[PDB]
Amino acid sequence: QCNGIYIWKIGNFGMHLKCQEEEKPVVIHSPGFYTGKPGYKLCMRLHLQLPTAQRCANYISLFVHTMQGEYDSHLPWPFQGTIRLTILDQSEAPVRQNHEEIMDAKPELLAFQRPTIKGFGYVTFMHLEALRQRTFIKDDTLLVRCEVSTRFDLE
Numbered sequence: 085q086c087n088g089i090y091i092w093k094i095g096n097f098g099m100h101l102k103c104q105e106e107e108k109p110v111v112i113h114s115p116g117f118y119t120g121k122p123g124y125k126l127c128m129r130l131h132l133q134l135p136t137a138q139r140c141a142n143y144i145s146l147f148v149h150t151m152q153g154e155y156d157s158h159l160p161w162p163f164q165g166t167i168r169l170t171i172l173d174q175s176e177a178p179v180r181q182n183h184e185e186i187m188d189a190k191p192e193l194l195a196f197q198r199p200t201i202k203g204f205g206y207v208t209f210m211h212l213e214a215l216r217q218r219t220f221i222k223d224d225t226l227l228v229r230c231e232v233s234t235r236f237d238l239e
Contacts (some may be wrong), residue, residue, distance in 0.1 A: 089224035089231040090117040091172075092128060097226045101212070104132040104142075115149045119232045124163050129203055130232060132212070144171070145212045146228070147203030150196060160238060164197040165189050169230040171210055172224035181218055183210050184229075 089162075091236075092114040104110050114128040131145035145171055170184035185206060189196045195204035215221060 085117045085119070087119060088120050088233065090230065092228040092230065093225055094228065095225045096219055098224050104134065107134055107136060109134060114228070118153065119234050122155050122158065123234060125151040126161060126230070126232070127151055128228065130228065131175070142209050142212045144206045144212060145205070145207050146209040147205035148195070148230070149201055152199045156198060158238065159200045162191045163189050164191065164235040166233040168231040169205065169209070171220060172227040172229055173218045173220055174227065176217040183214065183220070184214060186211065200220045
């Protein structure tokens with residue numbers, strides 16, 4: 085990305101929901117994107133927990149990852165900032181009831197450390213059932229929005 089917000093489109097979503105319905109593990113890897121030209125490179129991982137999972141069953145999981153970037157040697161580490169993850173309600177703009185969370189990066193976590201070769205997010209980001217409570221899936225596609233605010237202050 086150029087600015088600081090990315091929109092990850094996940095199509096063929098219908099087949100994923102049926103896979104998780106018949107007890108088949110599902111994980112999706114998004115493309116890596118930048119928090120800004122001179123910035124950090126991140127990617128997302130989405131999970132659809134099995135119905136037989138002891139904990140967090142039928143929940144959608146979403147984690148953020150740090151990748152190796154072209155400007156790595158030029159930026160301060162670890163990464164600091166505010167990340168907003170949102171599963172977009174595709175209903176009309178004036179009546180959208182999006183589903184999201186906001187988190188501040190934590191330096192002590194190896195998830196925000198400079199890569200060399202573990203992610204951070206929510207195990208229970210959104211229950212699958214919640215998908216039928218709105219028009220989150222339109223045209224067999226789900227939309228995940230990641231908006232990052234980078235803090236370059238060394239304080």
